[PDB]
Amino acid sequence: SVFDSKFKGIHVYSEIGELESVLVHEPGREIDYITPARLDELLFSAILESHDARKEHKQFVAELKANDINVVELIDLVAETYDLASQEAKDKLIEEFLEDSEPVLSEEHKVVVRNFLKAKKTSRELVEIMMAGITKYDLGIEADHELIVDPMPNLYFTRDPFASVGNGVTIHYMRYKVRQRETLFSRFVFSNHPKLINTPWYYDPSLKLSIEGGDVFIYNNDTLVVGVSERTDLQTVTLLAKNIVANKECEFKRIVAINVPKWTNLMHLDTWLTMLDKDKFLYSPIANDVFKFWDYDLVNGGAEPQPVENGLPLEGLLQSIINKKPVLIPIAGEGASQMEIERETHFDGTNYLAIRPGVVIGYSRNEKTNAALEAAGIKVLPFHGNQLSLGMGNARCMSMPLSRKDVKW
Amino acid sequence: SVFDSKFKGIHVYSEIGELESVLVHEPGREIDYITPARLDELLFSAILESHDARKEHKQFVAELKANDINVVELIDLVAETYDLASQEAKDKLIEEFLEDSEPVLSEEHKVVVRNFLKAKKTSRELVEIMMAGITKYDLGIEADHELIVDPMPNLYFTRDPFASVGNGVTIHYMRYKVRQRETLFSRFVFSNHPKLINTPWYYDPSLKLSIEGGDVFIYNNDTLVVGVSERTDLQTVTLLAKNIVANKECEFKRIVAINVPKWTNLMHLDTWLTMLDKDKFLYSPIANDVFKFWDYDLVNGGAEPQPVENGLPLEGLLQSIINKKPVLIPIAGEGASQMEIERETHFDGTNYLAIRPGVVIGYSRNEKTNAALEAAGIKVLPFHGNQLSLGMGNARCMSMPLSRKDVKW
Numbered sequence: 001s002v003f004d005s006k007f008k009g010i011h012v013y014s015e016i017g018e019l020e021s022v023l024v025h026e027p028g029r030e031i032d033y034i035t036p037a038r039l040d041e042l043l044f045s046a047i048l049e050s051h052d053a054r055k056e057h058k059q060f061v062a063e064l065k066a067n068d069i070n071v072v073e074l075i076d077l078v079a080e081t082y083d084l085a086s087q088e089a090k091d092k093l094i095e096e097f098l099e100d101s102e103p104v105l106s107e108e109h110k111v112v113v114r115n116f117l118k119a120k121k122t123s124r125e126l127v128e129i130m131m132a133g134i135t136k137y138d139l140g141i142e143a144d145h146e147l148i149v150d151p152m153p154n155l156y157f158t159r160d161p162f163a164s165v166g167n168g169v170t171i172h173y174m175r176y177k178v179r180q181r182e183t184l185f186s187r188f189v190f191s192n193h194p195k196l197i198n199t200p201w202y203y204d205p206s207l208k209l210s211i212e213g214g215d216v217f218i219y220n221n222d223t224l225v226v227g228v229s230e231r232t233d234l235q236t237v238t239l240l241a242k243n244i245v246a247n248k249e250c251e252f253k254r255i256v257a258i259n260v261p262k263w264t265n266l267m268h269l270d271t272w273l274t275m276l277d278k279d280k281f282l283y284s285p286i287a288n289d290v291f292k293f294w295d296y297d298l299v300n301g302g303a304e305p306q307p308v309e310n311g312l313p314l315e316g317l318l319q320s321i322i323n324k325k326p327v328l329i330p331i332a333g334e335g336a337s338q339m340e341i342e343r344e345t346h347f348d349g350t351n352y353l354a355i356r357p358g359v360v361i362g363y364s365r366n367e368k369t370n371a372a373l374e375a376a377g378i379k380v381l382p383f384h385g386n387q388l389s390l391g392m393g394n395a396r397c398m399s400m401p402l403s404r405k406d407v408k409w
Numbered sequence: 410s411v412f413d414s415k416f417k418g419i420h421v422y423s424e425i426g427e428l429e430s431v432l433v434h435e436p437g438r439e440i441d442y443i444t445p446a447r448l449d450e451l452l453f454s455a456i457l458e459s460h461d462a463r464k465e466h467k468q469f470v471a472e473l474k475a476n477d478i479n480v481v482e483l484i485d486l487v488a489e490t491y492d493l494a495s496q497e498a499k500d501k502l503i504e505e506f507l508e509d510s511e512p513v514l515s516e517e518h519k520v521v522v523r524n525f526l527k528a529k530k531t532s533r534e535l536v537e538i539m540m541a542g543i544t545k546y547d548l549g550i551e552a553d554h555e556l557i558v559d560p561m562p563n564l565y566f567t568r569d570p571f572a573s574v575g576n577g578v579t580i581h582y583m584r585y586k587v588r589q590r591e592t593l594f595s596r597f598v599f600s601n602h603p604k605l606i607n608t609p610w611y612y613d614p615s616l617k618l619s620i621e622g623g624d625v626f627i628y629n630n631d632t633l634v635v636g637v638s639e640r641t642d643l644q645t646v647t648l649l650a651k652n653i654v655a656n657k658e659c660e661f662k663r664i665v666a667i668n669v670p671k672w673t674n675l676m677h678l679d680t681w682l683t684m685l686d687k688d689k690f691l692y693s694p695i696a697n698d699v700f701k702f703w704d705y706d707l708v709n710g711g712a713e714p715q716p717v718e719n720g721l722p723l724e725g726l727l728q729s730i731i732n733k734k735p736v737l738i739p740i741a742g743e744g745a746s747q748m749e750i751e752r753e754t755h756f757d758g759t760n761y762l763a764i765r766p767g768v769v770i771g772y773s774r775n776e777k778t779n780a781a782l783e784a785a786g787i788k789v790l791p792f793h794g795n796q797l798s799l800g801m802g803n804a805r806c807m808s809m810p811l812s813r814k815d816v817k818w
């Protein structure tokens with residue numbers, strides 16, 4: 001199994017607890033289909049050099065493993081799940097894939113595609129092709145366009161389709177179709193894998209209100225933090241609060257929604273503010289005047305708690321969550337120039353993955369931010385990911401914790 | 410000197426003769442000032458990771474040097490010229506630099522910058538800062554904006570400010586101000602360095618008709634080929650023909666103007682068609698229905714040769730130049746998908762530098778084009794330059810031949 005023996009189920013009650021299991025995805029053939037004319041549509045700042053990108057991702061994975069972390073590759077998890085899934089589950093995955101296809105498939109092409117998918121010899125090949133996209137060449141047919149089924153180039157950012165929330169999970173209604181299609185696999189593994197089937201869902205794609213994993217944070221057993229960004233709307237958080245209040249076993253007591261600049265290239269709260277240690281936060285000063293907060297009471301707020309604006313400054317807001325004096329580390333460090341803050345913020349300089357309290361992994365490129373993290377007492381385990389970074393996401397974006405060890409608060 | 414013992418002056422009568430001396434420029438501090446909001450303005454497709462960019466450039470230079478080529482760094486050529494220039498030329502360099510500043514300098518800032526420049530102890534320091542740009546921090550002054558004088562980030566694309574033409578040169582009036590400023594150094598070295606001072610100019614920046622080096626090709630002793638592109642206009646070529654005729658020592662007899670797609674990211678003829686061997690050419694099929702041609706008779710066309718339309722298809726046009734059937738190699742090779750052609754054409758897949766007939770240097774990333782070149786009998790010496798490529802130019806763009814050995818046609 002992709003899961004080691006200790007993995008029981010989803011268990012993520014912090015952003016910093018010693019990481020046990022994490023989900024990743026090395027960019028497959030899907031990124032080979034990104035073209036100049038479709039960059040904006042496919043959500044990339046520039047075309048990645050595929051070979052280097054895959055090499056960079058392997059170093060990322062290696063670093064994770066060197067820290068005794070159980071790394072799970074999306075493709076293998078999906079294929080493992082497919083292998084032990086009921087025939088109906090197997091056929092439904094193929095039908096839903098066809099129905100949610102982009103572009104929308106004429107009936108003739110649907111038949112050809114279904115037959116092509118079903119003719120795949122192995123479980124992994126099936127999954128690979130569904131993620132990669134399908135060309136007229138692959139099908140052996142004539143067509144007025146090369147991509148019969150578009151790629152899912154953003155799959156390597158496993159942070160976004162679904163988020164582990166305590167022992168539950170939120171499978172999202174993503175903002176753009178190009179990524180919405182990714183939640184097909186999320187629904188598949190949680191609805192069918194032995195180790196995940198019991199996982200409760202606090203949100204699902206049918207809900208139609210936009211929300212993505214990069215905006216979801218698990219600060220502690222009591223408080224969740226969700227961004228109001230280019231990808232997640234406040235009304236969606238309100239629905240989430242409702243769904244959580246409706247789940248009895250869920251023990252979270254509060255949600256703090258945090259407003260951030262609605263930039264298409266820094267699209268989630270995690271590209272503006274992250275929690276990297278018990279009392280340490282990394283943020284980009286560029287959002288100084290935009291940050292705005294709302295509290296949701298999941299205890300005494302009724303079955304449908306509403307957002308109550310919290311007028312505290314960022315430091316006071318954070319202190320109200322952890323009950324300790326918070327340390328705020330600015331992108332590029334004290335004394336950085338605006339050019340440096342803009343450039344390092346641009347390359348997701350706030351987006352580090354904490355693998356243990358105060359120990360993080362992130363791109364080596366943001367050197368001034370790396371220096372600032374070290375100076376603040378945080379250990380940085382850099383890895384080279386210049387190509388990967390062109391997809392506009394750093395290490396947090398390319399990971400989805402499945403289980404973290406308890407934090408000694 | 411930066412020039413080796415044998416360099417005698419400009420000697421470029423082809424695109425493929427054994428390269429003897431070539432001008433390059435390793436990206437200095439100027440690229441650290443590229444910010445996300447200024448990408449389109451500064452002419453970059455994305456922000457380069459500066460450190461890797463410089464390492465990539467050193468590899469490019471190492472490859473050139475491994476092939477017995479005298480590689481000249483622009484900073485050193487300018488500093489060397491400065492050291493031997495008259496006090497009048499030295500002072501004027503600084504005044505013209507201030508006069509042509511972007512943004513335009515206030516009188517107060519003008520005095521501050523001038524003093525700062527004159528206070529630099531070494532000529533290399535002076536050239537470095539003029540290229541890099543100047544911040545309020547560098548000057549130790551208070552200001553509303555950080556950049557008092559903008560960087561000239563594109564300087565590493567030495568192919569464009571001026572072109573060696575036979576034993577003469579064309580110093581250009583470039584399309585955009587951000588690059589026009591680079592010609593300051595071009596005029597300076599050709600007006601003061603003893604080994605360049607006798608070079609005749611067939612064009613200078615004061616003419617105000619747009620033209621750039623990437624559009625200039627020296628096919629052979631009789632024929633010059635100039636692109637009609639996003640950066641060079643047909644009327645400019647007409648003025649060039651006029652200037653060449655006026656020069657009695659010049660021996661070129663014909664100019665073939667070639668119309669190319671006017672794409673902002675594939676801005677010169679050399680991003681669409683290049684000559685890499687005595688009869689081998691690399692082109693992108695994407696320009697197939699756009700290529701159009703004109704002929705200028707430099708011998709019997711009068712004092713002001715006019716462009717005469719040439720109706721031959723590309724193969725016939727090229728044959729009329731080399732008097733031999735050309736071999737046309739398409740980007741990504743035979744059978745490539747349109748996605749492959751679009752991607753490799755995008756990364757300047759046509760932009761290779763010939764260091765001798767049938768032997769070229771260019772980025773390793775365009776693997777299908779590299780394979781097609783080798784399959785066509787051309788030896789490729791690749792190097793990794795993924796960061797450099799984000800500036801939208803390849804090896805030919807990053808070099809300006811100063812002298813080549815005669816070709817044994």
Ligand SMILES: *[C@@]([N])(=O)[N][C][C][C][C]([N])C([O])=O
Pocket residue numbers: 042043044154157159160179213214215267268270271391392393394396397398
């Ligand atoms: C991080 N979690 O903010 N996500 C980055 C996702 C980048 C991707 N290209 C997209 O969704 O735009």
Ligand SMILES: *[C@@]([N])(=O)[N][C][C][C][C]([N])C([O])=O
Pocket residue numbers: 451452453563566568569588622623624676677679680760800801802803805806807
């Ligand atoms: C090569 N000669 O085609 N020139 C590329 C120059 C790229 C640069 N960023 C600019 O001038 O746009």
